[PDB]
Amino acid sequence: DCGLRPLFEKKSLEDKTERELLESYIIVEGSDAEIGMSPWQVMLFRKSPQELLCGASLISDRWVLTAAHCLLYPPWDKNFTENDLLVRIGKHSRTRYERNIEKISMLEKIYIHPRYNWRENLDRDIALMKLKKPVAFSDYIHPVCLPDRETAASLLQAGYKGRVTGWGNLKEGQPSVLQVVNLPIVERPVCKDSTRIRITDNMFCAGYKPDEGKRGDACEGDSGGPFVMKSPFNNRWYQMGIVSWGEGCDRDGKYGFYTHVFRLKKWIQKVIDQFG
């Protein structure tokens, strides 16, 4: 049932920019998201003090996927436990408590990839969060699909556009509602040559070239959010990447880097059918 949106696919209605994604299968400078556009978008919220930590995604009624550096990053003494965070699902507005719409859940357990490399390049920047109690789906809460080998192979290609969402800063200042932007996947060589950082296979970068004219990128607060694509084969939405890092935001000649979800699917399935 994953990847089919109650207010769109289920009703055969399409959001205003999805066609841009399909046409390519041959947040800074983003736009406001329509209601129910990303029912899997999750907000990582800090209790004391109350603030937006990062983005995240719902992949089942009990699991949330996000970037590991959102929880653990020694360079900034960042190390959160289950009791320090809250998960807000079904939101649209960044600051308002959407009564009768959003759902807030406590965490039962956090799982960070054992080989997450915070010391150097944030390799394997991924983590799973098990909710204490299952959340009920609705028109605004619905899981995204995780890719299978075949979907990843045919969609994760240079020039193919994906979509990123989040309540992060609008510039390297904050949005009132969920922002959205469609970005093209960039060739590995171009990614490697734009930074001094050692890029691994567990990553991919996306963004427009400085001469493409179009702008767009993730930014602070957006980390841990989903990079999703719509399969033109079964019309479902699949999460291909996780907003991981970047040097600044929407800076020319630079690109956002994402955790390669499929490459780490083995670890994901292993944790799920072993701890819950």
């Binding site: 209790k47 109350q50 603030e51 809250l86 600051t95 408590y97 807030i104």
Partner: peptide, 10 residues
């Protein structure tokens, strides 16, 4: 600037 959420969750 975040609106207070129910105490039940906190």
């Amino acid at each position: 600037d975040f609106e207070e959420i129910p105490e039940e969750y906190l």
